[PDB]
Amino acid sequence: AGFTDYKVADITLAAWGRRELIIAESEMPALMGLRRKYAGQQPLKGAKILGCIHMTIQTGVLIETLVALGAEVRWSSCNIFSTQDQAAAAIAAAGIPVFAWKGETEEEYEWCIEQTILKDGQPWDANMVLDDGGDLTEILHKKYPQMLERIHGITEETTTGVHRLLDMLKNGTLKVPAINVNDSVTKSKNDNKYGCRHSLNDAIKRGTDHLLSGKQALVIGYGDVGKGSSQSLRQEGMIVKVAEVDPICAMQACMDGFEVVSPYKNGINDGTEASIDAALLGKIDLIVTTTGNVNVCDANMLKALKKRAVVCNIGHFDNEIDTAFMRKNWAWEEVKPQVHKIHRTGKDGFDAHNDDYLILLAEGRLVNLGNATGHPSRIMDGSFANQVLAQIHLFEQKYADLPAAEKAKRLSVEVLPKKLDEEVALEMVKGFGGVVTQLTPKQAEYIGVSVEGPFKPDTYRY
Amino acid sequence: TPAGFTDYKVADITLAAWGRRELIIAESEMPALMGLRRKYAGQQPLKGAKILGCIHMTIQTGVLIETLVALGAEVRWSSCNIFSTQDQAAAAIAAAGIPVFAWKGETEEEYEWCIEQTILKDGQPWDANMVLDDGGDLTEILHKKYPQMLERIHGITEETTTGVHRLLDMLKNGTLKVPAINVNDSVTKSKNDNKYGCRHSLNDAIKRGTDHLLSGKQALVIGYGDVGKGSSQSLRQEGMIVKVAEVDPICAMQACMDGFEVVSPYKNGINDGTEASIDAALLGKIDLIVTTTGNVNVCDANMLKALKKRAVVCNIGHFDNEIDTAFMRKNWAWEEVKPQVHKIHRTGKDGFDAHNDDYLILLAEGRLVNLGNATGHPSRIMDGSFANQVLAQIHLFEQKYADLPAAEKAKRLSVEVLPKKLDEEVALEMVKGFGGVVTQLTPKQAEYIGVSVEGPFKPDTYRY
Amino acid sequence: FTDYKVADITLAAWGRRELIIAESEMPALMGLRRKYAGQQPLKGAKILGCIHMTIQTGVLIETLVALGAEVRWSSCNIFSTQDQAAAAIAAAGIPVFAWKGETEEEYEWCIEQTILKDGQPWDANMVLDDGGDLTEILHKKYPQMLERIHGITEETTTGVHRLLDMLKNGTLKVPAINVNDSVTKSKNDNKYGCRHSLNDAIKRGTDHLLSGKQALVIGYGDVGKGSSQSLRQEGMIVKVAEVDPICAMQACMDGFEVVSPYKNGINDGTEASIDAALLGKIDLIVTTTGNVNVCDANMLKALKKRAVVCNIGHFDNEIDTAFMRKNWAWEEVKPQVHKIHRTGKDGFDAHNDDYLILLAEGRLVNLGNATGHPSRIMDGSFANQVLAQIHLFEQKYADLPAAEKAKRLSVEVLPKKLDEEVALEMVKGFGGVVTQLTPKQAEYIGVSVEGPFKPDTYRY
Amino acid sequence: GFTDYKVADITLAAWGRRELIIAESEMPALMGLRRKYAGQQPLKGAKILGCIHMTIQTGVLIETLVALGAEVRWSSCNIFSTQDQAAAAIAAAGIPVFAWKGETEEEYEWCIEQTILKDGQPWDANMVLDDGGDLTEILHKKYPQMLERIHGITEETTTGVHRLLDMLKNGTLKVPAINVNDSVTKSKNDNKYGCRHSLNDAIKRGTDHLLSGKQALVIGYGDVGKGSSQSLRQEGMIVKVAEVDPICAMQACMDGFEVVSPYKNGINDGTEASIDAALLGKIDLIVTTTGNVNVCDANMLKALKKRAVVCNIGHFDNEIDTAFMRKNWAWEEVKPQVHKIHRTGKDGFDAHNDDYLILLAEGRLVNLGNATGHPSRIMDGSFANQVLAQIHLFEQKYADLPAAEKAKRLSVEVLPKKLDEEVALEMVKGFGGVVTQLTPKQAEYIGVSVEGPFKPDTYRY
Ligand SMILES: NC(=O)c1ccc[n+]([C@@H]2O[C@H](COP(=O)([O-])OP(=O)(O)OC[C@H]3O[C@@H](n4cnc5c(N)ncnc54)[C@H](O)[C@@H]3O)[C@@H](O)[C@H]2O)c1
Ligand SMILES: NC(=O)c1ccc[n+]([C@@H]2O[C@H](COP(=O)([O-])OP(=O)(O)OC[C@H]3O[C@@H](n4cnc5c(N)ncnc54)[C@H](O)[C@@H]3O)[C@@H](O)[C@H]2O)c1
Ligand SMILES: NC(=O)c1ccc[n+]([C@@H]2O[C@H](COP(=O)([O-])OP(=O)(O)OC[C@H]3O[C@@H](n4cnc5c(N)ncnc54)[C@H](O)[C@@H]3O)[C@@H](O)[C@H]2O)c1
Ligand SMILES: NC(=O)c1ccc[n+]([C@@H]2O[C@H](COP(=O)([O-])OP(=O)(O)OC[C@H]3O[C@@H](n4cnc5c(N)ncnc54)[C@H](O)[C@@H]3O)[C@@H](O)[C@H]2O)c1
Ligand SMILES: Nc1ncnc2[nH]cnc12
Ligand SMILES: Nc1ncnc2[nH]cnc12
Ligand SMILES: [K+]
Ligand SMILES: [K+]
Ligand SMILES: [K+]
Ligand SMILES: [K+]
């Protein structure tokens, strides 16, 4: 009542969002377990969290868990297409500041982040940051250093954001410590891999309703996202080829039953059209970029792709695909929101029955969130249980209140302890109805662990 | 070849020409190992090395042995398991003039005697200066029984998870006398050999031992580490309905996401020692149990008593004590079907009825089943592991730990892994052997993600 | 042009964009347009059509029209229409009566609107049907219209069954072609189509993770085979129920555990007969049988809390949804997704944990909660439909003498050569290359180089 | 003093018996018939000439026929498919069997002749069980007087049925036959899932090659090609499929395989120029599954990637042009049923030559040649059908009918669906599966009897 401190597409979607949040709570036992465990302790009482992450139903359950543990938040999405408008509405209607809708312009995206940072035109009294991709983190360091003086930490969701943090640390420009949430095993080897397994073919089906069985796919990259993406397509019956620059990841692709190829002859990308394996790309029906790198589906690749191939990206940022080239040279025909036919016949107009087009999904933005709903609740449970534990840890450490000599000793980018990683995993397993076996004292002694764990040395790769 | 060569003990020297035929085939399947031969033969980096080697005497180990020799080493060899030798591999190596003491079907006494025949030459300690081990038995015998020989040894290169665990325990207790390289934890070993090797060779061994249809039947895999992951896939890809047990909730999470039901042999996961804690309804439905843990007594006597009639029991971890075979020897009658395949009649100890329906089928007497009942991992997978072995041997031999003063020795007494750059170079040769084409980063791309164009491509923290 | 009724005519441009995409996905059907356009084999045909008004059906409709036909069209399910497809067809001046979310009364009205033109029966002479509802209405309510109709081409397993029952009973009035049992229909559409579209519909309705959860698929015919694969490939632990031991054998060999909801498989009506331990572990039940009450009231009571319940057979009586309407409280999550609260009939607690999630109110879930089968699969089914329409229309049964009619009153399938010719176009659509026998090789196996390559008994 | 047999080594009998006793526990449909019909002795007076792979599984079939009252004289239908411990155990039981692994072609013919002749004269045979048609052909060509007294042939496999149908077409078939192959519990169990189990099995035993990540080309996508393709894909091979039948090719595409032809545009015109050399030069493994002739021809063999494996899982070895390889290339035996074929010439080879192919089982049925064929629990279905087929034709007593009645009965038929379903039910119970029973209302609703059959005869499963 009287609450106007938000901006969403349609507040009347709130009841629908609330119904979906109630379903999602039953799919997120690790997060709901954190709510029950810590609600009395209120470990986030006094925390004021700036949050920048895809404003989905799953993020709604994360926000309400932080709030239930005592935090106040101000929220935005980290992508212009990833918000679920009913989730945003349900959060705003609960009295929580959120600035997010599906289909933002770049200008609106920046404005939404700014509305979390500023309250009534002045810097909010923020003391914690939760980020996915590093955009909020970057704006705070470049534009609001006085705010970082009073911030105790950053908890960063995703591979790309972690890389940006490590670059700041290397350069001496990171102002507050961070937890790399991505590299919990219950994040990286759950969300990044199995989440894309679930949601990649999901988004492609919703966008195009194409049969995938029997068609040819090229997955660029075979890290955690590339592994999950390749499985998402292979399990549908696609004939999947994999490209990689890392020979260890390429080895895994071979042993997993994929043919490893390069878009470039002998894998040498010298910028000429002559370097493109036109015979290979002329047979590809679907290309997916998974790298976190720049220009891995480039202009000459796009020119050589089979007519009517689908082009999409599931890495964090759209510059994996040279969409700028396509905006400059080719005519875009909107099929429906986040689905565009790109006519390679020219820039000025198109024939409605032209056969020489590509289908681009989500304008090159994260395709699982742009054309579907991203990862499912029961996977995001893992990632967001880690986020909550990381917020608790850094808020309780109170870095901003430390003397300068003590700050220097704690300015780092760290992961959560393996014991907590395991405790999140156990809640996930119980959610499936799995029954973990308890070591006898002799067995725990034999392999050199405590019965309650941790069960593996920190070097273990799973 | 050498005139009058008698410094070996194998089952049947007439298998040597067959073994050599298979070695020549394997060379074509092991491009990383054969690349090291081509790259380093001229340099002879192992000239002067005298390697004690203890690892399964397979055709794949033959190619490893002849790679070490080609690079300048002398070796004396034994198997690290009583059932894992391929007799034609041992024969071909002996016929090449290489001391080898190994045959399929050793007794435990013969197994120990074979290791001692590598340690000893003409009744006295060989002047060994390198060790290559798989599981730590030779490492243990040297420390326990021949500690003075370790004064001349520059390093141990240890193949497998269990062996590394034993080394780390020695290091922490102050009992390890020479530095070691953990070959297991190269990604081109652990995430190639331990996983994909078992995927290939578990169902292979079960088929050769039993010729049982696997499709449609119920399996329980104990463990979901690298071997458990590969083993579960070996069975699921055949159409088994696979359930997975784990103590590690992270590994259990992966099993659930990989499409397996995660269960415990014990009610609520709690073993209280009693038969009442066994989930007898679960175990009464299981057609196949596979242990993969590297732990002790994970398929215990009460589980064995509860298993479905005519279930197959096997172990693919390094040591046989994963299964309580001792209980079965004490209480139940063993009927050999053929070598390494026994029906174990639960009707009693003394005799058995030839037509009794209440038996279990034990493979390889509970020893590593892929090597006991088939041929272990294929050459193209062992290529990764054994390329790492050669590089580790070169590294420790060139470091010359035994020649350092006692102060410098304390600084280098460690258990280390190979650097990621080398791991990557092994993988690249493996990928090329499949005909795969790795893409080269542009300078701008390499700058963008913060790597060199030549690698390494991942931080040391990366888990693949 | 006002001779239509759709949800929103302004969706026409969107539907037309998707029809142009779908044409590129349907080489067999577009090949028929190109090859028969000159002949106009359906010139003079007036086709009553009743099948899911999807984008794929739009390409079928426009193929029939391109070959000379006139049509009047309705959907064969209340939830399966894609409104943009219906709009695009209406905007092309083709009469269609169909929208997503019809009531049962509106569904019947829509069929009647195809049957009647300007308050009088249309001079129809052909029928295209999916499930047999239009066939049934013509026989029961408008039998004199059947005196001018040359044949029926029936799409699906349930409709074929209904045709054979009338043939057996002497009540079928016109000849029919069983389109379902072309191999490029039954062993393409019924199986692979459900493989594509079942997990699709479950994700769109619930966004549930499927990996690691327990499913029970009731049935293992073609739909059950495809459905089981749809779930297993996502990582579900899939159990299968069957009454047919041969289909059950296939499930075992395919790597599924075969179970019954009933102790020892005996469904004697009592709660005591339910395997409550089994059902208490199931996260998802999918019915695929074309039978009645295979997910019954006692099974629904025993199911794990928050399990998903859906049906991908033709009719919603596979699940006892009437029991649930009578006894439990329905909370709509969003269209075609309902939480059914087992706490009672009148009202519910918004935070109650004891509910089931029913998709599409028990109607065909792939069409109700997603878009049904993809264009490239429907290409096979609808190429057969066009060929079957050409064949019956040219036979001109309604014009034959009575004794000539008695000899042609049957339910037939298309010849194998045509089945193979559809398959060849589908294979070419994937870039596949079929090998041609040498004369010696064809002699050796006793076939012609042209084919057909298999005897009519071959099961593929 | 039983001497009416010839096997490799009779001392293998005890080992064979141990394996028969295990296989009995894996064959519930077949052992179910043994228990059901033992008292009635429905094959009393039957005298069966059998020609089928002398495996442990065939051992259980033979002893089921004998337990039901039959006498038999047995041979293998392939020179490499016998399991010598199975043959020894059968001989040691007093059953005439002439079979060993590694027969020459002359010995193969001699073995069949030893079943046909007893003490130098025609045996008083009155039934035939065959797998591939060689025994059936010899009887028709050489022993027509014996066929006058034979009541029927029960034929196991696709190729043998084709041969029967050709004879029926030509009016040369002299006795009726049951096509056992086309029971669903045979064709869609044995032909498909049996090859799924045993193809990668045989390749591993012959070569120990890693299959994951390598390229395979499967020629054919019928029942054997479907199972074979799955055998390789499930191991992680990248599997391409060739077909002449566009419906089978459509299935391969929808099952997630790339469909390719060895020949450019699929046109096999006999020229080297017609070979897709780029494709063949990428293939690590080629498997023929067709029942056809020369589907892996000389020009394909010349074009294959160095060190590719070549094998055949169709009934006969002429699927591959091995004659060409014998005539032009040097053969190096690696071990029994594994040969390197050196494409450098005919007159000897270099032991370190890199340009060779690996041929398994000299192109004969590779699952049986290099491993043990299908597993017992799959063969259970096929051989339950064989037993039922033998009972049916023996009880019809065709040989004793008047000429006019023979004419009405001379046919090639399948077993009725009710039997096919009952076999399937015993197989499902063997897995612990529980089939649901229709209610009366449900049976009425779909128009079937509660006991079945549940499908019309047109149903394809
Ligand atoms: N859409 C989602 O829901 C989602 C989920 C998790 C992460 N992500 C994002 O996806 C991206 C990848 O994440 P990750 O965890 O898999 O990282 P990763 O480091 O595990 O994998 C990236 C891979 O790309 C490869 N690569 C780099 N440049 C390449 C090139 N030119 N050609 C081919 N391969 C190349 C690398 O070798 C590496 O193996 C990041 O941007 C991450 O933030 C997205
Ligand atoms: N046979 C082969 O070819 C082969 C190859 C590689 C390694 N190995 C051997 O296999 C064993 C396992 O190796 P790994 O690399 O997988 O090790 P790992 O540590 O990766 O996996 C062992 C797993 O067992 C689980 N576990 C332990 N005790 C358990 C119990 N009581 N119940 C259930 N799960 C339990 C652990 O949680 C762990 O995840 C070692 O002995 C190793 O030397 C064998
Ligand atoms: N949704 C779709 O897109 C789609 C596509 C094709 C067909 N269908 C419909 O799906 C249904 C099934 O079609 P089909 O082609 O698979 O038919 P089918 O005859 O091939 O299979 C139905 C199966 O259900 C089994 N069954 C019957 N009663 C059972 C019971 N009580 N418990 C367990 N199993 C039982 C039968 O034994 C049979 O194998 C029909 O209604 C058909 O019209 C739907
Ligand atoms: N080894 C075994 O255990 C085993 C088991 C069953 C059958 N078989 C034998 O295997 C063979 C195949 O049996 P099936 O049941 O699969 O028969 P099938 O008729 O179902 O399949 C053979 C397939 O080969 C295809 N084909 C023919 N010539 C071809 C060519 N030149 N190129 C590509 N494809 C071609 C046909 O179109 C057909 O689909 C027969 O000889 C049969 O007797 C062997
Ligand atoms: N559903 C989701 N919600 C929030 N962040 C995500 N990242 C990937 N999927 C997501
Ligand atoms: N094991 C086996 N025994 C007999 N015939 C077979 N055909 C295929 N496998 C067989
Ligand atoms: K979601
Ligand atoms: K091996
Ligand atoms: K569709
Ligand atoms: K066998």
Side-chain angles (χ1 to χ4, degrees), chain A residues 283-403:
Chain A
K283 294 194 321 144
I284 295 298
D285 299 295
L286 163 70
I287 181 170
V288 187
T289 59
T290 71
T291 67
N293 209 334
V294 53
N295 210 25
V296 310
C297 178
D298 66 17
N300 288 332
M301 290 170 61
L302 292 159
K303 291 160 71 169
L305 270 175
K306 193 185 181 174
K307 290 187 188 184
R308 301 180 295 272
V310 174
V311 178
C312 65
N313 164 58
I314 195 158
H316 187 79
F317 283 126
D318 56 276
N319 60 347
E320 308 216 14
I321 305 161
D322 196 351
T323 67
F325 168 84
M326 294 201 291
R327 298 186 182 282
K328 214 288 291 268
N329 291 276
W330 294 337
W332 294 37
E333 169 186 25
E334 187 171 310
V335 179
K336 67 181 182 168
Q338 284 75 242
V339 181
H340 287 88
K341 292 162 62 201
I342 319 286
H343 295 264
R344 301 186 293 191
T345 42
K347 155 97 155 190
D348 291 340
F350 61 95
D351 189 317
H353 296 95
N354 171 49
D355 70 333
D356 187 4
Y357 61 88
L358 304 169
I359 294 179
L360 173 65
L361 297 180
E363 302 192 47
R365 275 71 174 168
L366 300 132
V367 65
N368 58 330
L369 289 146
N371 285 86
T373 68
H375 299 349
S377 302
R378 191 170 292 273
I379 284 183
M380 290 313 294
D381 193 34
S383 310
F384 287 169
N386 281 281
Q387 277 288 357
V388 169
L389 292 165
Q391 284 285 313
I392 289 165
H393 181 70
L394 284 177
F395 180 68
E396 286 181 352
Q397 166 182 79
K398 291 298 196 293
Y399 176 92
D401 296 337
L402 299 177

Side-chain angles (χ1 to χ4, degrees), chain A residues 183 244 246 256 262 437 456, chain B residues 196 246 248 439 458 463:
Chain A
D183 280 341
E244 254 287 357
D246 182 326
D256 292 344
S262 181
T437 297
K456 299 289 185 301
Chain B
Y196 303 124
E246 256 289 355
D248 180 326
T439 301
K458 299 286 188 299
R463 297 193 172 97

Side-chain angles (χ1 to χ4, degrees), chain B residues 18 20-22 24-25 27-29 60 86 196 199-201 203-204 207-218 233-234 236-239 287 308 310 335-338 341 343 354-356 359 361 374-381 433-435, chain D residues 15 17-19 21-22 24-26 57 83 193 196-198 200-201 204-215 230-231 233-236 284 305 307 332-335 338 340 351-353 356 358 371-378 430-432:
Chain B
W18 170 29
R20 174 59 52 193
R21 289 191 297 263
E22 289 199 345
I24 288 171
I25 296 170
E27 293 166 10
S28 72
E29 288 287 303
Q60 295 66 47
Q86 295 184 272
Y196 303 124
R199 183 200 177 181
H200 173 103
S201 60
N203 68 47
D204 189 12
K207 288 180 190 174
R208 299 188 197 204
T210 69
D211 294 290
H212 276 353
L213 179 65
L214 306 178
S215 317
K217 295 184 184 168
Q218 305 267 327
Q233 180 59 23
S234 198
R236 188 249 297 278
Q237 73 196 30
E238 289 274 332
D287 299 296
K308 190 179 171 180
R310 305 186 288 283
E335 175 189 20
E336 180 169 311
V337 179
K338 63 183 185 165
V341 181
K343 287 162 65 199
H355 294 103
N356 170 47
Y359 58 88
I361 296 188
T375 68
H377 299 353
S379 303
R380 193 168 294 273
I381 282 177
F434 293 102
Chain D
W15 169 30
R17 177 58 54 192
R18 293 191 296 269
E19 288 192 344
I21 287 168
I22 295 167
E24 287 161 19
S25 78
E26 290 285 302
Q57 293 68 48
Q83 297 182 273
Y193 304 120
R196 174 195 190 180
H197 176 101
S198 60
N200 72 47
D201 190 12
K204 289 183 191 172
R205 295 187 201 206
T207 67
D208 292 294
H209 276 355
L210 177 67
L211 306 173
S212 318
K214 293 181 182 168
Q215 300 272 324
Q230 178 60 24
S231 196
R233 189 243 299 274
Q234 78 191 29
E235 289 275 333
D284 297 298
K305 191 180 170 178
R307 306 184 287 282
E332 181 188 13
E333 184 178 317
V334 176
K335 67 174 180 175
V338 181
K340 293 162 61 201
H352 291 98
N353 175 43
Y356 60 85
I358 296 192
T372 68
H374 298 353
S376 300
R377 193 168 290 274
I378 279 176
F431 292 107

